[PDB]
Write an enzyme that holds these catalytic residues in place. Sequence first.
Site, PDB file in Angstrom:
ATOM      1  N   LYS A   1       0.166 -64.740 -43.474  1.00 54.21           N
ATOM      2  CA  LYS A   1      -0.660 -63.699 -42.586  1.00 54.21           C
ATOM      3  C   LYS A   1      -0.640 -64.112 -41.438  1.00 54.21           C
ATOM      4  CE  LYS A   1      -2.924 -59.683 -43.557  1.00 54.21           C
ATOM      5  NZ  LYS A   1      -2.513 -58.868 -44.910  1.00 54.21           N
TER       6      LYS A   1
ATOM      7  N   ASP B   1      -1.299 -54.595 -40.664  1.00 56.15           N
ATOM      8  CA  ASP B   1      -2.487 -54.963 -41.297  1.00 56.15           C
ATOM      9  C   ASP B   1      -3.654 -54.274 -40.337  1.00 56.15           C
ATOM     10  OD1 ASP B   1      -3.968 -56.393 -43.530  1.00 56.15           O
ATOM     11  OD2 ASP B   1      -5.052 -56.729 -41.645  1.00 56.15           O
TER      12      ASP B   1
END
Lengths: 459, 459, 459
Positions: free
Chosen positions: B113, B153
């Site tokens: 991430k 995201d």
Amino acid sequence: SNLPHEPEFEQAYKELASTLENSTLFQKNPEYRKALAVVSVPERVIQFRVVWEDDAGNVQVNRGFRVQFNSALGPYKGGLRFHPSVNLSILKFLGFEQIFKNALTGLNMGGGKGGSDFDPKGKSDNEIRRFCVSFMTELCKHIGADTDVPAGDIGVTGREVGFLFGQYRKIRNQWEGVLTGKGGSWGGSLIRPEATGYGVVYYVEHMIAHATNGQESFKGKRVAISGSGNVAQYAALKVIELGGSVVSLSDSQGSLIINGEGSFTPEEIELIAQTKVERKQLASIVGAAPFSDANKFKYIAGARPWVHVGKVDVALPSATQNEISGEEAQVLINAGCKFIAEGSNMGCTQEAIDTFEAHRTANAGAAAIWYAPGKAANAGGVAVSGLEMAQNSARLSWTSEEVDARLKDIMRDCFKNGLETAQEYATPAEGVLPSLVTGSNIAGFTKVAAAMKDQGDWW
Amino acid sequence: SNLPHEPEFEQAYKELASTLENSTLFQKNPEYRKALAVVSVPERVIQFRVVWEDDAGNVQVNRGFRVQFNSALGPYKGGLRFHPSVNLSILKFLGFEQIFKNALTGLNMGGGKGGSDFDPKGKSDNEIRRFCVSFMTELCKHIGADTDVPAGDIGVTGREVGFLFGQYRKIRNQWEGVLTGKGGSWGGSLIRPEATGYGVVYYVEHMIAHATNGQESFKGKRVAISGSGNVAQYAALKVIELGGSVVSLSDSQGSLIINGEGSFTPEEIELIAQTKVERKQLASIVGAAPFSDANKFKYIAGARPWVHVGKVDVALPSATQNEISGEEAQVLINAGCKFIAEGSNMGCTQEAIDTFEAHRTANAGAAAIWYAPGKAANAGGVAVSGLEMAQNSARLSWTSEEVDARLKDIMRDCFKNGLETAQEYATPAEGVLPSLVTGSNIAGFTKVAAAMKDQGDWW
Amino acid sequence: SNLPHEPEFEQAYKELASTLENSTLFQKNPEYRKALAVVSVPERVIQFRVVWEDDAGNVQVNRGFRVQFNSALGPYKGGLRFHPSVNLSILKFLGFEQIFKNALTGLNMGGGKGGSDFDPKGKSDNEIRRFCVSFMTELCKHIGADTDVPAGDIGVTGREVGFLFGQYRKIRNQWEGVLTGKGGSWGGSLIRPEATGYGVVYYVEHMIAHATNGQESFKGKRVAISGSGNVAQYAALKVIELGGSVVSLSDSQGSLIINGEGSFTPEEIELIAQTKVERKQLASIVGAAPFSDANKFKYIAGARPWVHVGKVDVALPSATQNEISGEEAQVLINAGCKFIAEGSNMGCTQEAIDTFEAHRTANAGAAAIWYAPGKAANAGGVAVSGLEMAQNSARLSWTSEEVDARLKDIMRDCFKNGLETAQEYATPAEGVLPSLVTGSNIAGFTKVAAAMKDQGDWW
Ligand SMILES: NC(=O)C1=CN([C@@H]2O[C@H](COP(=O)(O)OP(=O)(O)OC[C@H]3O[C@@H](n4cnc5c(N)ncnc54)[C@H](OP(=O)(O)O)[C@@H]3O)[C@@H](O)[C@H]2O)C=CC1
Ligand SMILES: NC(=O)C1=CN([C@@H]2O[C@H](COP(=O)(O)OP(=O)(O)OC[C@H]3O[C@@H](n4cnc5c(N)ncnc54)[C@H](OP(=O)(O)O)[C@@H]3O)[C@@H](O)[C@H]2O)C=CC1
Ligand SMILES: NC(=O)C1=CN([C@@H]2O[C@H](COP(=O)(O)OP(=O)(O)OC[C@H]3O[C@@H](n4cnc5c(N)ncnc54)[C@H](OP(=O)(O)O)[C@@H]3O)[C@@H](O)[C@H]2O)C=CC1
Ligand SMILES: O=C(O)CCC(=O)C(=O)O
Ligand SMILES: O=C(O)CCC(=O)C(=O)O
Ligand SMILES: O=C(O)CCC(=O)C(=O)O
């Protein structure tokens, strides 16, 4: 600036820009003028010296090029041309066209083109090998399976692709789909040899069906072809398969025309194919059977075929740029020609295009000669190159039937896209055929321009 | 050590570790305690300064990150978050979760991430472009199609993916599946925009079928959703398609709730989608039609939707971490909520989870509220990202129907895996629903732990 | 072929080739004709689009180039030019000359040149920064401390070198001597700002000593200079230091000439230097003190200085190519000019060169005007760039005195080489000065040609 004179590139640019202006595109999206200014300057161009050794042991020098024009839609993709005319102007016209052609295939391929002023004529196979070795020694730094994937074009066959691939593998120490047009046992695709010529004929089949409401096809039509290399050969073969007659082929020294009614046969095409593998002229085989039969064949030194074929129904220029003059275009119209599609890149002169497009505007329906640009009609080659890349990435080989089926679908979609886009942005008068050149140009340009905007190349 | 305080990461770790301990896993495989200690320290983290220029010409500085947590099962895979809260703690929680989520998809994807404390709100599109250009100038060194494949995201849409992709291609000179969530003409996948929200709803369909022995579905159910971005929008759309009612959406400034019986419609969702593209709040559109209709809509400033929707049957938190408190969890139980699935990563507080899980243990069958963790329910997004990678590697584009069919199969298998694993390792009392959080955690962890052992990461 | 028209390149090539033919070189080494054919085609040229953002937020497009002409003697080495005239022809002339210039320094440096048609005039410092950032984003792939080491030239100062270096370091993540002309604290060399202009004057000192048997020097001589940038400024400063008078400077809009006897002073040169840092014209400072003093200064709009300075003893064209016409050359001869050395690359027209060389042949000893080509006289800049590379590779910084001493030795050796080579291969009549243009060309060419043969570039 101040910019060099690049007539071929300027011609290609001006024709694209003209079609975009003569539409509602810039009323709907005036910001696309910015896209046009950006897309018209290549992302990258590499020029390099190529020193190679001739069969007498003497140093020879040629110039090498790779134009990497646009990569918004995919890795740079397009062929290599080995011809004494080659320079940056010519390769820019080709690479520019390639961007929009590639966009019409529906596959992820950017636009590029390269090659050399090396002349394969009069060279031995050994000399061609040494040249390709030297050429790729420099080019390999700049290309790769996810970077830039060259292929053949004029003067570059599977033979040269082989020598190029071998040297790439030796230096880069990777075996990958860095080139297309490869040999069957070392990553080639079935149908790639056929693809360009087959695709041109598939595309014209759609043009005939549309213009004639399904009443006509290639069956019984007379088709004048120019050139006698890869595109001309397989376009001829497909025409014959569909029941059409091929009434001419040609090369840089003259035209070989059917004398009366009749056609080239597949066996004759194969003899011509072997002659061209050996880098020999049509002039060298007209002194012996079957081509010495003056009842069937007429060889005309120094001529293009267009004014010598008599009545014809379809013309497929398949040799080189600017090979149909304005006068030749009128002769073809007078000969009853109703379909003209470019196998060659920029095959028609601007005068020819203007003549064909004025005729379309002036003559309703099937009375018009309908012109399809190379970026639409000849896109089958690069499309099947994309499928060769797909096969190489899958590490599997598809059947002839599978590749050919995809090729047919791509050519159908390309035609529909050009037709529908012209109907939307450049709506013709009632009963008038839409402009496939305008439609194809808008459809390819907008797809590239929008992807460029998404990627921040312009804003 | 001595280690920094990372509350979000510690929360995620503790919940995983707790579920593993409250099972027979470490009786059967006590050596997996070693795997847990190793997997919990990221393989690599890159932090970098991002300097960028605002529209006034002034220097601005933000912090960039990429956490490359685990690559046993595949290249690192997970999104980029642009939100002012971002720091290493938050990205570690997200990347940690991502390892196990990715494991449940059945595809070869490792966990990672990244993102930045850059706040897209109040920025122009030009400012976002310049930020993405600077961000990728550093990030491109660390990522790649077989290395690390980011995506969106919170705060990263297809717009930002585009600007990021463009700069990667410019520096790296490779066109490849380095990012997912790409645009349709430049390597995107159909169904990727829909995938996360669709998947959450597909997963809950299985929960409803199981808990009710096939007697109920989404048809006629009231569904409270939070957030109004990518996950919330398409979860809402799928609910509506299945005959359910969507009774709330929300953003960081307030909740927009259906007043009485009724639902958001697809047309209303599209208006909200366009507002969020422009980075505007729900508060800015409630002064005009249709959202000014106080009979249909109630906007509540500063609130989450859970206590304001009245009776509800399903809750899908789809905004951000820790957005259902312990008190809100009890209110939802009191409102008749029987299914709660996380669209958002770590959407439930630990207090909420404990409340839901105690309720499940205390109430047989369909009387229980059944909680599904984000790593199971929201895995559809990353799964379809994997399929986008697959398409890019094939150099072909699949149909909407093909991608959606695969998405449905992946969500079904994920549910079955969590259910069956909990039945094996954390067997519930007769008539009690198995713990999907325990099952999903064990199933994902064991797959990663065993692959790590095979690869020598621990022994 | 067929090759584009490149007049500047063709001019440079023809002058070199002519001097080689008018000597005994090809009697002694006829095989060097092959070397000439090979060396004249660049090893590599990169052209690339440069998109950059202006202060209004609008997209702008320029063309970038790097010509990597020859690397037999070392990594490619030569400056970057930012000027609206820039194209491939101009950069090829410059890069070609650079090969032989670099050869005369005695250091291991190959020849190259690059730049852009970007015009720094009218741009903000912020716009120049954004342009340099975009430019180097592409160029960094192609250059490096052991590959190709650029520097400034027209329109590229230490300011631009800084912005270029910063972006290279950011992408490549290496801190190295990839550029020269760097700042003192980040790898620059003392004496590099001075080097070109100082070197031109050092070289002419040797010409004066030789032609006059040590009887004259710069002391008391009147020196007409053109341009007002880096080369002109420091040539002027050195002349003043040696007791000469500087009687003119100029820019693209006009000439600023001393009215009568007198000289620019160092303080005046510094004011002009600051004006040029701000990218302003001489015309903008003649309205205020000191340059508004019409007793000392005459500003002539649109003129070159050569016909307006009256009697002069030395001319140092230091602006741009083709800035002394055939008519101007005759005027300088009529004005008593006995020494003309090019600070600018290809500063003299071919007509001027022919005029100077005919005069030398017709007039014994000190009665002749003696012409030195830029490749000899202006080589001090690139020589000190080589020393900057040497310092960076040593990871140490030398003193001003150390660099200047080496610069003096290099210029002395360069003069001696040109003089002695002309005496050997193009022996003049008794009492006639040897041709420094012929000598320098032969000395540089033979060194490159022989290294090429050793390395297998030709045989
Ligand atoms: N091969 C492919 O897949 C693709 C090719 N094209 C284009 O199709 C055309 C033909 O290419 P291709 O068949 O592959 O090439 P080939 O080299 O196989 O054949 C080229 C043919 O055109 C003739 N020709 C070439 N240059 C000239 C010239 N200056 N003047 C007159 N005749 C000339 C050649 O004759 P000669 O031998 O005497 O020179 C030869 O008969 C080109 O425009 C090419 O760019 C289009 C898309 C795909
Ligand atoms: N997109 C995907 O494929 C995946 C996303 N997820 C997760 O789903 C959730 C939503 O992501 P996504 O829809 O893509 O993101 P978007 O940015 O499209 O939407 C995020 C929504 O949540 C709100 N929100 C964000 N931060 C906060 C906050 N601190 N406090 C309150 N509200 C907040 C936002 O409101 P506002 O605009 O006012 O800030 C917005 O309505 C996240 O947890 C994400 O990690 C899960 C798997 C896949
Ligand atoms: N700097 C170096 O180390 C080296 C430079 N050279 C050469 O010296 C010369 C000057 O370079 P440099 O001093 O560094 O550059 P600068 O940009 O510092 O100065 C260039 C000067 O020449 C003028 N000029 C530039 N182009 C033209 C033009 N087309 N027409 C008329 N005047 C012009 C400029 O005026 P304006 O501002 O009005 O355009 C300015 O006064 C060039 O030929 C260069 O290639 C030689 C070897 C080394
Ligand atoms: O297959 C390719 O890449 C190129 C085919 C070709 O020569 C063309 O499209 O012009
Ligand atoms: O598609 C991806 O890589 C990530 C989707 C996402 O944001 C998530 O799983 O949290
Ligand atoms: O220092 C350099 O590399 C180049 C100096 C220069 O501009 C020249 O020689 O023309």
